[PDB]
């Protein structure tokens, strides 16, 4: 019972301690490509890089680099590509990835501007009649429809490979109410957002892995994938109470560094899993 464990940590207020043990035991792998001088401008943060072994490679002989990682959860039967919010110069690369990896959905957990500064580039068109064209990767992106709700907006986008004139519908799931500081008060809306993504089919195996990002693509994005996998496991296993969130998180960190950036996010993840389990279950 993780809800029982949850209350213990809370009782003895030891979230920092537990979160810190996870950090200590977290995997550490080479990030050689990420650090090559030529890729300096392809990284938003100096301390956030994809491990070489799990990085997404762009299909181009020029420079195949993009700060993104493939998180592959074998037992859960789910995969996710966690990436940083694209930069002014990596938007074409961002959509190239979405096309090459055959992704059906893009999940955004932040706003273009937060705490007064840019956390992500405006990488999608905001008006139907103003399509965007990425000359470097030869891609055309068109806003098809938009549905603004209280805590999130879902957009329908048409992505076209100008080289082949092939097209695909991409669903943009944008969680718009994540606080500038700290974590959400209640996992309620965050969970419904996740379920809406599940419902679209974007997380299903018939499609490439969903692309997820916040600013660095490790904190909020971490919370999203950790909660989704844990719920899914509790759904699969003969004994749902055997799902250990701390171990699942560590398995994920084998594919990308720093998933879950604070003890607050860790507690929030527990909170979301526990709440989502109560609904999904009974
Ligand atoms: C806590 O650290 C870790 O867990 C960790 C680890 O265990 C092992 C390896 C790396 C690790 O983590 C690496 C990052 C440690 C803390 N670094 C920072 O805050 C920033 C980059 C950053 C920005 C926003 C964010 O998240 C937001 C978002 O995207 O909006 C969100 O989730 O809300 C996450 C990371 N770097 C920075 O200022 O440059 C410097 C510090 C160089 C000046």
From Swiss-Prot:
Substrate binds at residues 180, 214-220, 261. The modification Cysteine persulfide is found at residue 214. One of its GO terms (biological process) is positive regulation of protein tyrosine kinase activity. The active site is at residue 214. It catalyses: O-phospho-L-tyrosyl-[protein] + H2O = L-tyrosyl-[protein] + phosphate. One of its GO terms (cellular component) is cytosol. Coiled coil: none annotated. The modification Cysteine sulfinic acid (-SO2H) is found at residue 214. Residues 2-276 form the Tyrosine-protein phosphatase domain. The modification Phosphoserine is found at residues 49, 241-242. Disulfide bonds: none annotated. Oxidized on Cys-214; the Cys-SOH formed in response to redox signaling reacts with the alpha-amido of the following residue to form a sulfenamide cross-link, triggering a conformational change that inhibits substrate binding and activity. The active site can be restored by reduction. Ser-49 is the major site of phosphorylation as compared to Ser-241 and Ser-242. Activated by phosphorylation at Ser-49. Signal peptide: none annotated. It is found in: Endoplasmic reticulum membrane. The modification S-nitrosocysteine is found at residue 214. It is a peripheral membrane protein. Interacts with EPHA3 (phosphorylated); dephosphorylates EPHA3 and may regulate its trafficking and function. Interacts with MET. Interacts with NCK1. This is Tyrosine-protein phosphatase non-receptor type 1. It comes from Homo sapiens (Human). The gene is PTPN1. The chain holds residues 2 to 283 of 435 of the full protein.
């Amino acid at each position: 019972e993780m809800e029982k464990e949850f209350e213990q940590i809370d009782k003895s207020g030891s979230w920092a301690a537990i979160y810190q043990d996870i950090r200590h035991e977290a995997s550490d792998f080479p990030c050689r490509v990420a650090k090559l001088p030529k890729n300096k401008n392809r990284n938003r943060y100096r301390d956030v890089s994809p491990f070489d072994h799990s990085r997404i490679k762009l299909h181009q002989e020029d420079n195949d680099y993009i700060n993104a990682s493939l998180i592959k959860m074998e037992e859960a039967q789910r995969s996710y590509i966690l990436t940083q919010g694209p930069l002014p110069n990596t938007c074409g690369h961002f959509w190239e990835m979405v096309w090459e990896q055959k992704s059906r959905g893009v999940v955004m957990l932040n706003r273009v501007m937060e705490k007064g500064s840019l956390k992500c580039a405006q990488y999608w068109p905001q008006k139907e009649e103003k399509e965007m064209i990425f000359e470097d990767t030869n891609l055309k992106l068109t806003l098809i429809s938009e549905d603004i709700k209280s805590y999130y907006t879902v957009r329908q986008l048409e992505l076209e490979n100008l080289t082949t004139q092939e097209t695909r519908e991409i669903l943009h799931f944008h969680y718009t109410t994540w606080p500038d500081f700290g974590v959400p008060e209640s996992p309620a809306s965050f969970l419904n957002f996740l379920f809406k993504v599940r419902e679209s089919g974007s997380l299903s195996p018939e499609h490439g892995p969903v692309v997820v990002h916040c600013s660095a693509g490790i904190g909020r994005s971490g919370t999203f994938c950790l909660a989704d996998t844990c719920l899914l496991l509790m759904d699969k296993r003969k004994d749902p109470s055997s799902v250990d969130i701390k171990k699942v998180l560590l398995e994920m960190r084998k594919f990308r560094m720093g998933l879950i950036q604070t003890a607050d996010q860790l507690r929030f993840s527990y909170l979301a899993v526990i709440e989502g389990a109560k609904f999904i279950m009974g």
